[PDB]
Design a binder for this molecule. Structure first.
Ligand code: WJR
Ligand code: LMT
Lengths: 316, 239, 327, 238
């Protein structure tokens, strides 16, 4: 009963924390994407596709962090509500609770293994294809109102622009061919009430038509080729990455002893910093192996150092 | 069985809150760890429970040392703890509250675990709320459920923290009746409380801790006729 | 009343300054960690550290609203958890008086923000850019005239000028070109090889601000540069957004401090210090995200950026005032 | 001068914790607002203080309505509150603690503010700790400093919250002597406390609130001989 009670609490609070962290981080990135779109360097109608495709990559970090924060919240609530005093007072240690939640740790490890091995590379490759499709936009796609946009041999000025990047007003186009149009709608662009000049030729018109990665590779294609440092780094990251769930379990068991007065959220920030330090160390090791300087052996070493530290802290 | 504690000591920022607290309690005894507020009775009780690690001290339970043991190991050795605050599991029902601790008993199987849970519910008259959550019960019912859950662990020494805290005088009698049951089942009961006058009414052997040291020992009558307890703790007049 | 006011102001100011120092240190460390993956032959670890340190005043300027929010939360939580605000009310000091004391404390951070924006950030940003590493191909319009220069300097020289004139009918009048140019007075530039076809208001003080993004511009530089456009051209919406974001920064800080005080007196009353800090971090992230998103939306939507910038501030001030009214 | 409270009401998640609590207190009286724990005595006391706003109620102070006023406005009207917790300013000395509230007085100038601070320090025997910070004083000294600080505002009705909480039986006499000098200064004192037995020893007029309603009224002798009070609160033997 105690095991299912703890599993229910941790699953509920970890789902809440994962949803909250997804909202926070993924919306913070979506706001940067929206700013890029407002600057004309990205389509406003495809940013949601980027959100969908980068969901596995963000969840790859949110799931261990969310599980760690949820474990901290549950254990801090147990300590604050004096439910840990009666659990300890009944012979049930905190390490006993950590061992009881081992099956949930394995479930989350399987989920994050699914994310890292399959879902994250698929999302990354879809997002890379989308970015390559969105890195070729040029011309009137990048225009901004009351500004001059230079893209290759084209200099473009627009006096006004709608909410969407269509229906331009006060258009000045430069090549040498000069085209000045009162209106223009979008590269295929239909200009309205414009004048064409060549530098000397002049042509007036009422209307005119103008016509100016290893992180994403499949795990099946990277299971072999351990000799390549980049492939070795990526596969070690995809294989030893999911064990951060288990590290988070034994770390949130270690760093959750809080008094009722301090509160449930008192020890979150230092422990979140410790977990983020572990993840930053993992990223640095990934880069180092990609540079052929550290080797795959550093991933289990990095996980084991933090695991041993957490075990020693929990058994002091 | 006896719980022998001797030479307790603890400092807070190089300030010795507890200095040489020694007291003995046996199974089937209601021993009161009393004293002036902040004089070390609470800290001594907490180190006895295991919530505050001792700086200098020796705790024994029938020639079995518990000084190095953690709180859960001491509990496995036969020591129970009842927190003053609401220690009931909020999202578990009262029957589930008792059964969660009952399922940890290695000498009880499910067939007799159910019988133990039923008789624990019937003993404390909490059967009518066996299907109700721990947050949706009254203070007295919640405390009875907590005590039943603590008894489900089968402790040899139940350490009560402020049992008469925030309780009406009408229910002080009910708490006294409960804590006299805990001594009818053999469970030695160690009580620390600010409400000393009603604590001394059930204690068989009282200890007064002043400025970190034990200054009295004996029956409540001996405490009430002491010339130092009434000089530092109980005052000149005390009914 | 002076001792109560001095005590509240000192405690809150110490909280804001400590939070400011902690957040600046954390954002310097995080920025250095993020920059450590961008090292090359000419950009070593020391170069990255120098770039991060030179960008530290800009990071501080960005933190000061959130720093003031978290500092007000922490200081008033220290007072409330110690029941100092309860007795302050019980002796006859209103909630709005304590809020005014906290606002007086945050005025120090407002003045620090002003100083950083005017005299520190514009120079340290240039230093950071120099450590990491005056406009070429400058295209400008002056009324009905389009001016293109391939190279301009702050000293007042032009290379490869190309000015095209027009009328209300958008008809070619004169397309003059040049190879070299010089600046002598406003509204006239001496130049050689004046190849004028038959069928200038550029200023060298504002040349160096063309490459600088509107957000990075100081308030004095931004105001002067927008005035230069409004006198000679049409100001872009991004410059208006930057101006409205800079003029509403002290007001945003004051409103966020007021929101922190109202939360302490309201929803965050009797809560843990850790919970108060977590809620303060959440409010800071929400405010930063909301202001960034509305600044971006002001550049894509018809209404002026003033609405999108002063919307969150006015609404947060109203919410804080209502929460203070609820006591 | 009287503090009239009538028909208090308050609910928590559509659960009426307080239902028609009415009691009257005069300046110079030590009135006890007692009752079983969680029965509405604490909520009624808090509504009288102003910490929790009343859903339905009427509070008067010498034919002056205080129902719509806030906590600080009621305090300016002449109501004092002594929190049960350690409410001293941690980083302000005891003399500074008293002077901080003395400076809020509009009828006192600094020349006589200093004299008032000196006589308040001398009154409560806290002169020896006048230069010691509020976070570095003993519990009794801190409580005396808090009471002196509350008196520095010159209240007409001092509302004490659990004065006999966490106090030794020897030190109960000191608290009783203090609460009797707040009444010997003309400061009506309203006391809510779980420790009813030492509360009834000083109160001149006690009120018992059970299940949100007042069930008793009169002297402590009248309270101790009330069938309902000892049937729901005090018990058969007391
Ligand atoms: C094992 C199990 C687990 C595994 C887990 C593994 C990991 C999982 C992974 C999952 C997936 C993932 O990753 O998910 C996240 C990551 C999650 C976090 C990490 C987690 C790790 C694990 C441990 C936990 C997404 C990500 O990673 O996104 C980065 C993005 N990063 C950030 O945004 C950082 C912070 C994350 C903070 C983490 C630390 C704190 C939490 C622990 O936010 C977020 O993540 C979003 C969200 O809110 C987070 C919420 C967290 C909540 C946590 C709650 C618990 C990045 O942003 C760029 C910069 O943005 C801001 O600064 P400013 O910009 O305004 O100056 C950022 N500051 C701010 O906002 C200020 C904000 C901070 C943010 C908001 C608050 C957060 C608070 C959190 C608590 O604080 C404040 O207000 C004060 C505090 C307020 C809050 C208080 C509570 C900068 O942050 C900082 O300094 C650090 C922060 O302060 C720390 C916070 C400290 C708080 C105390 C940022 O570095 O932009 C990147 C792309 O960017 C590019 C691109 O590549 O496409 C490149 C850009 O160029 C530069 C660069 O500028 O970086 C310079 C280049 O020279 C070069 O070096 C180049 C490159 O080096 C490559 O070389 O980088 C830029 O490019 C352009 C431009 O024009 O501008 C053209 C450039 O020109 C061309 O460039 C080419 C090139 O090089 O490409 C060249 O080839 C060409 O020749 C060149 N041609 C010419 C002509 O020049 C150049 O002109 C350039 C220039 O800069 C000028 O603009 O500009 C950009 C473009 O803008 C479009 O975006 O594009 C994104 O990556 P992706 O998209 O790939 O995802
Ligand atoms: C053990 C080593 C020391 C550990 C120290 C303690 C660490 C505590 C948590 C540190 C978290 C900072 O997290 C760091 O955030 C930065 C924000 O600039 C992220 O950086 C992000 O923005 C930069 C800016 O260009 C992008 O280039 C990069 O691709 C992106 O990830 C880093 O990827 C991440 O490592």
């Amino acid at each position: 009963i105690i095991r299912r009670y703890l599993v229910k609490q941790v699953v509920s609070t970890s789902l809440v924390v994962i949803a909250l962290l997804t909202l926070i981080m993924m919306g913070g990135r979506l706001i940067k994407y929206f700013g890029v779109a407002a600057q004309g360097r990205l389509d406003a109608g495809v940013l949601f596709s980027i959100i969908g495709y980068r969901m596995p990559e963000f969840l790859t970090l949110i799931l261990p962090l969310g599980f760690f924060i949820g474990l901290m919240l549950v254990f801090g609530r147990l300590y604050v509500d004096h439910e840990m005093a009666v659990l300890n007072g009944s012979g049930i240690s905190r390490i006993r609770l950590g061992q009881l939640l081992i099956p949930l740790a394995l479930v989350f490890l399987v989920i994050q293994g699914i994310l890292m091995l399959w879902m994250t590379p698929w999302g990354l490759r879809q997002f890379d294809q989308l970015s390559s499709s969105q890195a070729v936009r040029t011309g009137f796609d990048l225009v901004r109102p009351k500004e001059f946009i230079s893209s290759g041999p084209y200099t473009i000025y627009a006096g006004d622009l709608s909410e969407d990047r269509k229906n331009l007003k006060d258009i000045f186009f430069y090549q040498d061919v000069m085209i000045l149009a009162k209106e223009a709608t979008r590269n295929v662009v239909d200009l309205i009430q414009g004048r064409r000049y060549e530098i000397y030729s002049q042509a007036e018109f009422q209307r005119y038509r103008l016509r100016l990665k290893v992180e994403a590779l499949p795990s099946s294609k990277l299971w072999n080729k351990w000799n390549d440092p980049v492939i070795a780094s990526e596969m070690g990251w995809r294989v030893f990455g999911p064990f951060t769930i288990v590290i988070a379990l034994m770390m949130a068991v270690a760093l959750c002893e809080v008094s009722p007065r301090q509160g449930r959220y008192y020890r979150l920030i230092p422990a979140i910093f410790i977990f983020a330090s572990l993840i930053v160390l993992l990223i640095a090791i990934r880069t180092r192996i990609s540079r052929d300087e550290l080797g795959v052996w550093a991933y289990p070493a990095a996980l084991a150092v933090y695991g041993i530290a957490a075990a020693l802290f929990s058994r002091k | 069985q006896t719980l022998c504690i001797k030479h307790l000591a603890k400092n807070y920022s190089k300030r010795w809150v507890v200095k040489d607290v020694s007291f003995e309690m046996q199974s089937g005894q209601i021993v009161g760890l009393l004293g002036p507020n902040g004089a070390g009775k609470t800290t001594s009780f907490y180190m006895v429970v295991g919530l505050v690690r001792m700086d200098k001290g020796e705790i024994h339970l029938d020639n079995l040392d518990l000084s190095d043991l953690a709180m859960h190991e001491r509990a496995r050795k036969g020591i129970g703890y009842l927190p003053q605050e609401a220690s009931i599991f909020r999202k578990l029902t009262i029957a589930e509250n008792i059964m969660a601790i009952l399922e940890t008993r290695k000498d009880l199987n499910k067939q007799q675990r159910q019988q133990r849970l039923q008789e624990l519910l019937n003993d404390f008259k909490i059967t009518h709320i066996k299907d109700s959550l721990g947050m949706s019960v009254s203070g007295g019912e919640r405390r009875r459920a907590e005590i039943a859950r603590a008894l489900a662990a089968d402790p040899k020494f139940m350490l009560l923290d402020e049992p008469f805290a925030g309780v009406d005088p009408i229910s002080v009698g009910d708490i006294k009746d409960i804590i006299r049951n805990l001594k009818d089942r053999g469970i030695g009961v160690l009580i620390t409380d600010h409400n000393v006058r009603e604590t001394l009414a059930i204690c068989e052997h009282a200890y007064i801790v002043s400025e970190g040291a034990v200054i009295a020992e004996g029956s409540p009558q001996d405490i009430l006729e002491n010339e130092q307890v009434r000089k530092v703790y109980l005052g000149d007049d005390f009914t | 009343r002076r001792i109560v006011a001095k005590h509240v102001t000192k405690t809150t100011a110490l909280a804001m300054l400590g939070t400011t120092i902690v957040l600046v240190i954390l954002q310097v460390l995080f920025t250095y960690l993020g920059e450590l993956s961008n090292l090359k032959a000419d950009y070593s670890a020391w170069q990255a550290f120098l770039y991060v340190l030179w960008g530290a005043p800009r990071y501080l300027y960005e933190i000061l609203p959130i720093s003031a929010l978290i500092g007000a939360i922490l200081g008033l939580g220290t007072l409330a958890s110690n029941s100092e605000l309860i007795v302050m009310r019980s002796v006859g000091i209103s909630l709005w008086r304590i809020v005014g004391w906290v606002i007086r404390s945050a005025l120090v951070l407002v003045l620090l923000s002003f100083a950083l924006s005017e005299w520190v950030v514009p120079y340290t940003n240039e230093r950071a850019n120099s450590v990491k590493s005056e406009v070429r191909g400058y295209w400008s319009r002056e009324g009905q005239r389009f001016i293109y220069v391939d190279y301009a300097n702050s000293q007042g020289q032009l290379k490869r000028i190309q000015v095209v004139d027009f009328d209300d009918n958008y008809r070619l009048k004169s397309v003059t070109n040049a190879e070299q140019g010089q600046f002598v007075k406003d509204g006239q530039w001496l130049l050689n090889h004046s190849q004028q076809m038959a069928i200038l208001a550029l200023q060298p003080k504002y040349v160096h601000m063309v490459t600088i993004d509107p957000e990075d511009l100081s308030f004095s530089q931004l105001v002067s540069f927008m005035n230069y456009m409004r006198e000679y051209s049409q100001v872009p919406k991004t410059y208006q957004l930057a101006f409205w974001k800079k003029v509403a920064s002290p007001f945003a800080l004051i409103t966020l401090v007021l929101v922190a005080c109202s939360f302490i007196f309201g929803p965050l009353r009797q809560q843990s210090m850790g919970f108060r800090l977590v809620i303060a971090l959440f409010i800071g992230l929400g405010f930063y995200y909301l202001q960034d998103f509305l600044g971006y939306a002001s550049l894509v939507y018809n209404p002026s950026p003033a609405w999108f910038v002063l919307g969150p501030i006015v609404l947060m001030f109203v919410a804080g005032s209502y929460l203070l009214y609820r006591a």
